[PDB]
Amino acid sequence: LSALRDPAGIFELVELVGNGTYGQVYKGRHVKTGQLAAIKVMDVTGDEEEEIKQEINMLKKYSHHRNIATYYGAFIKKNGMDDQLWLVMEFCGAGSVTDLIKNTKGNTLKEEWIAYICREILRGLSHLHQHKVIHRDIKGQNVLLTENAEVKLVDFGVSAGTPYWMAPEVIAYDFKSDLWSLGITAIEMAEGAPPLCDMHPMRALFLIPRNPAPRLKSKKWSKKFQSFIESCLVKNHSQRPATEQLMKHPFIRDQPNERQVRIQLKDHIDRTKKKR
């Protein structure tokens, strides 16, 4: 019901943080408590109304898992200047996995960090898949980190371009397509960019269903990580493992430093804020 409250006196915009496939996202502040939130500001027209209402319902029902940024509420800023809808979400201070790769020296993440991040994406995906929901847009831009290095999934717009993370069956499907995208995100974390990044999106769209399943370029990566990527990236989706199966894989299952990897990531986050 689009008869929502005006945000005036409740939530205030502080700084713009996001500008991707999800739109114009701001770092907002709750006036009375001083708590931070992510506010997505979108122009509410006559035509575009059905797509916005579907995104809200998805968030209201499915965002209540620890690996998905929580929905806090929605507001309409009444205004020649069209009315704006404010989508209030849980704030993830450390930014995206894409930013984490860009800030790390040599644009590659430590294998132990990849395993932690992948496990958290997989847990969030498991929650969505249990509720018969496909994310449809898994990529480093959509995987965010909190200041305490907690991993949260964002953007349910596509759930309600850049084909680099798209599974062959999607280009040609079910929950298994998100697991292909996780594999591509894992390579993105390992190599700094997804396979076929250097090519035009049209060539990538043509090549993905035709080329054999991608693999890691370097021989430096562990046999466990190499097998994980191979398990994720199975072109024939019928033969690709489910979410619960992939969670049981040694790369995800055997992570002894869950406490010591989180502390390392938090220290890397703190070094980025302190140094400029």
Ligand SMILES: O=C1NC(=O)c2c1c(-c1ccccc1)cc1[nH]c3ccc(O)cc3c21
């Ligand atoms: O929900 C969010 N929580 C967030 O923290 C957040 C969200 C979104 C986003 C919000 C609504 C719809 C789609 C994406 C985009 C975002 N871009 C961002 C860029 C940097 C950042 O630190 C946080 C976000 C961010």
Ligand code: NA
């Ligand atoms: Na949540």
